[PDB]
Design a protein around this ligand. Structure first.
Ligand SMILES: OC[C@H]1O[C@H](Oc2c[nH]c3ccc(Br)c(Cl)c23)[C@@H](O)[C@@H](O)[C@@H]1O
Ligand SMILES: OC[C@H]1O[C@H](Oc2c[nH]c3ccc(Br)c(Cl)c23)[C@@H](O)[C@@H](O)[C@@H]1O
Ligand SMILES: OC[C@H]1O[C@H](Oc2c[nH]c3ccc(Br)c(Cl)c23)[C@@H](O)[C@@H](O)[C@@H]1O
Ligand SMILES: OC[C@H]1O[C@H](Oc2c[nH]c3ccc(Br)c(Cl)c23)[C@@H](O)[C@@H](O)[C@@H]1O
Ligand SMILES: [Ca+2]
Ligand SMILES: [Ca+2]
Ligand SMILES: [Ca+2]
Ligand SMILES: [Ca+2]
Ligand SMILES: [Cl-]
Ligand SMILES: [Cl-]
Ligand SMILES: [Cl-]
Ligand SMILES: [Cl-]
Ligand SMILES: [Mn+2]
Ligand SMILES: [Mn+2]
Ligand SMILES: [Mn+2]
Ligand SMILES: [Mn+2]
Lengths: 232, 232, 232, 232
């Protein structure tokens, strides 16, 4: 099984598997059951922005989501990710739909990792090309004619389809920590557009870090966000 | 009086003004009396590296100092710096000597600030030019013929002089936070060479953030590190 | 008199002082009389993007302007800028109106300089704050309530006023070259909105590099773009 | 056959296949026979630094090599690399030895590509880990216990072996240009240590850009630098 650290943008409350009452942002450490959540006041139909950051000295993984001119929602969790992830990881974005749906559109994605022992990896996408060679697209993930990364199935009219899962992994493995490292840090930004007809959009988007060979776990559909094989 | 947030590399223990027993790294918030310290196992005569970071979401100011192949020393302090500093600051490095001395040599200095509401300021020096126009040199601060930033007086033979104070401020004011900011962050690295004849080198080096018009406070000598007018 | 290297976005053709027949982008080296121009097919009312780059090895200063989904316009000029500018410069944006006008709105501005002998300065603005401490605003330059940098006078209704001049200089001087430098390079991006009622918008926008103490030359109005005291 | 754009650091003059009389830096466009060369005054046993840059507006690929406090050697070649390379490439470093040898030690390697239509890829290595997951090591390429990238075979005593070829490719494919691109640019730095017993060190090091599936061509040994299958 994969090792997952994720920041989830969870549009759909699954209280029966640990979710709070409402859409929330969450820090997921090896379980869909968030270690820390904050209430996410969704603005379906508007472009959202997520900023994620961590450094191995502060050991605080923090995420903030906002829309233009809105209140931001922040969530934090003290965690030494060295105890969780392998030295070499891949970073990615995942999304699902289930019984309920939403577009899981990524409009931009950037990521900077740094490893002082100064090693560094930065990538940033504003356009996604029709054939992203530097992306590993998994499942229903695809780039559309607007150069948007669509993590989950969307029809031609642009209606999201349910029971879809998809992710994009940056092609290059990231060295997020190392024995002699004095400090490893990473930051990530993605902007997203969740549109839905359902009065309860589902299921969400995550930025995630995993073992380099990470694949979509069987049964990771819907509330599991394409990240976990079960709700444990 | 100036508003100071600093990370101090305090070679000299002044227990009578709050210092612990030993050389320490410290997070200073508006007082030379550190909110958080860690024991700093000095390696006088060796090049040291300090990494400082903070973002307004995690609200954890963290610093780590190390020498090649040594144990690092980290120190952290949870603090919303918005409650401390004005929106616009200058960043700088300060050093002092007093009764006891040490060279306060800066070999490199870099700083990245970011302000999402994405505004950004990055500077990095590996060489310091004989006339640093982008630096505001205060007190005894000067760049030498090796292109090294010497914060405190050093003779021609290169012996440090006591009772010296000096700082370098990056010329451009940094906008470290702002009303609409969703997340402001900064990182700073400097490398330093502290050499001393004294069996107790003094007094230390800091990276600091202050009101843009920050100047060396009268009586900020020695244990006060060129940052504070008193030990309160 | 100031030393000017500029890339001009010249909305208004002044053939009587060297301009070609039409709006053009130009590389200006110590004269409003461009060393190289390209025809600039203006799209008044649309957001434009200028990319400027140079490195001291290739010695090719190049600029490209485009609007979304349009043909770009590029202009180049082989020049060792070491022979032109002093070691320490300030970078800025200038605009003018004269008999004819246009808004000279800067929506973003970034600049990266690098100096290997690796010294570096990066700044990028997407918002401009009401009081830009890191900007030196000259003349009619001001930031508006949209966080836009307006180089020239615009009324409350947002109509541009004629006979206006204004510039913004990044506060920190840039070390663009140095005796021991192996390679100095800089890149600059700004995005701009030129709106005009006049069927001939005037007078233009430039990104420019100048002696650090650069000020708006008397008589630099209109076709002189706030950069030169005469048309020589 | 692969499509190669390379900057060669050619320690060994092979005049019978187009080389000038002496060690040279060269811009190679789809042939080991450089389009442009400059005399490279080698400093075997000293750490060298190569800076490579290009942008699609200036269309000038330029490289400079230097050692601390030495005269630099620059070479340029006007070329639209869009006419040469496919949209998606991999960047790498190659080295060979043949009858004569040298260590082909890479101490650092960084690369920034940018694609405005702002997409971007930056990586920088100062240490190379024992298992570089983000590097595709080809042939004799390996990282040693000093965290140095050794492109060609070096014995335990650290003596280079002849008839060796090796390269490291950054794992992630780079999108170096694209139909809608307004400007694509890349910069690359690597530092290298060439040590040799031979009074004629061979054969050299290159930074290269190639089709993503680039492999070491059969017969690319020695003077062909692991880049070309023949000397045509
Ligand atoms: O898209 C939202 C959800 O729909 C599915 O579960 C449902 C949530 N509301 C329901 C009501 C009835 C039935 Br049957 C089901 Cl499966 C569900 C599942 O796919 C969930 O994993 C998912 O989170
Ligand atoms: O350089 C170290 C220190 O020397 C001075 O205080 C002294 C520390 N040891 C002493 C012993 C005697 C006397 Br008098 C003095 Cl001032 C000191 C002062 O300058 C201090 O601020 C400083 O920290
Ligand atoms: O804004 C465009 C121009 O207007 C002025 O010159 C005029 C261009 N068309 C004209 C026609 C008549 C007279 Br009088 C004048 Cl000054 C001009 C001047 O301010 C110029 O510098 C400028 O380029
Ligand atoms: O390392 C340097 C060179 O050695 C080989 O060619 C030789 C250059 N000097 C020679 C002298 C005699 C013979 Br046989 C050979 Cl193959 C060579 C070949 O491996 C070349 O490709 C290479 O550039
Ligand atoms: Ca859920
Ligand atoms: Ca002290
Ligand atoms: Ca004109
Ligand atoms: Ca050769
Ligand atoms: Cl339901
Ligand atoms: Cl004492
Ligand atoms: Cl007229
Ligand atoms: Cl021979
Ligand atoms: Mn959840
Ligand atoms: Mn102290
Ligand atoms: Mn003109
Ligand atoms: Mn050659």
């Amino acid at each position: 099984a994969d090792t997952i650290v994720a920041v989830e943008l969870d549009s759909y409350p699954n209280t029966d598997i640990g979710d709070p009452n409402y859409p929330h942002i969450g820090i997921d450490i090896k379980s869909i059951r968030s270690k820390s959540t904050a209430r996410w006041n969704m603005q379906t139909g508007k472009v959202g922005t997520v900023h994620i950051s961590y450094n191995s000295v502060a050991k605080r993984l923090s995420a903030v989501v906002s829309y233009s001119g809105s209140s931001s929602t922040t969530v934090s969790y003290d965690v030494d990710l060295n105890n969780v992830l392998p030295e070499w990881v891949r970073v990615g974005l995942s999304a699902t739909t289930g019984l309920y749906k939403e577009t899981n559109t990524i409009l931009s994605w950037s990521f900077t990792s740094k490893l002082k022992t100064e090693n560094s990896l930065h990538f940033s996408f504003h356009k996604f090309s029709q054939n992203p060679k530097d992306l590993i697209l998994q499942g229903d993930a695809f780039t559309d004619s607007d150069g948007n990364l669509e993590l989950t199935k969307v029809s031609n009219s642009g209606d999201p389809q349910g029971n879809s899962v998809g992710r994009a992994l940056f092609y290059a493995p990231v060295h997020i920590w190392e024995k002699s490292a004095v400090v490893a840090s990473f930051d990530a930004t993605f902007t997203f557009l969740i549109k839905s007809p359902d009065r309860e959009p589902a299921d969400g988007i995550t930025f995630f870090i995993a073992n380099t060979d990470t694949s979509i776990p069987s049964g990771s559909g819907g509330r599991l966000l394409g990240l976990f094989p079960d709700a444990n």
